[PDB]
Design an enzyme around this catalytic site. Sequence first.
Site, mmCIF file in Angstrom:
data_model
loop_
_atom_site.group_PDB
_atom_site.id
_atom_site.type_symbol
_atom_site.label_atom_id
_atom_site.label_comp_id
_atom_site.label_asym_id
_atom_site.label_seq_id
_atom_site.Cartn_x
_atom_site.Cartn_y
_atom_site.Cartn_z
ATOM 1 N N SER A 9 3.320 -8.917 -2.019
ATOM 2 C CA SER A 9 4.095 -8.231 -0.985
ATOM 3 C C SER A 9 3.400 -8.255 0.368
ATOM 4 C CB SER A 9 4.543 -6.954 -0.426
ATOM 5 O OG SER A 9 2.730 -5.516 -1.061
ATOM 6 N N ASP A 131 3.907 3.991 4.076
ATOM 7 C CA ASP A 131 3.644 3.677 2.629
ATOM 8 C C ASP A 131 2.780 3.564 1.816
ATOM 9 O OD1 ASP A 131 4.332 1.225 3.131
ATOM 10 O OD2 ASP A 131 6.076 1.010 2.071
ATOM 11 N N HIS A 134 3.064 -1.529 2.759
ATOM 12 C CA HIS A 134 3.093 -2.792 4.561
ATOM 13 C C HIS A 134 2.650 -2.683 4.980
ATOM 14 C CE1 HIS A 134 6.066 -4.603 6.906
ATOM 15 N NE2 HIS A 134 5.932 -3.812 7.783
HETATM 16 ZN ZN LIG Z 1 5.875 -5.567 4.204
#
Ligand SMILES: [Zn+2]
Length: 155
Positions: A9, A131, A134
């Site tokens: 990610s 979170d 990210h």
């Molecule tokens: Zn992200």
Amino acid sequence: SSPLLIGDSVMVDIGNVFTKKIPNAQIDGKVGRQLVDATPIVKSQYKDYAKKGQKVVVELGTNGAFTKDQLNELLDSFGKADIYLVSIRVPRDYEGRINKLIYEAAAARSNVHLVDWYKASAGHPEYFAYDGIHLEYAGSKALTDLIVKTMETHA
Ligand SMILES: [Zn+2]
């Protein structure tokens, strides 16, 4: 020649920022990608990046732990390429163990060049979304510049 950037990610977060800066970059990012699943992709899709004078960026571990053997298998699959291996910053119990693997591979391998995101981002809470996974846009810009600067100067 085009650099290859492969990761999880975090690679998804930086991919478009990176391509705007380096237009011929080849981005392969996938949310949730585990390092052990990158190696079959490299062996089957990226053999032409595993050559002397090629540059590859590895951005893995934020979305999951991996082992020393798994990392060695991925690094070996890039052959004589220069490999820019990014340390991770994530609120997970395995963070230190995986960064130790990353530091050790960069120490022992002459073609592995540490991109020490963990250390560089220590003073930058504003790089990380709530979170812990990210990257805020400012973080993606900073990581992009750090990778590029490492690639321009090497190990
Ligand atoms: Zn992200």
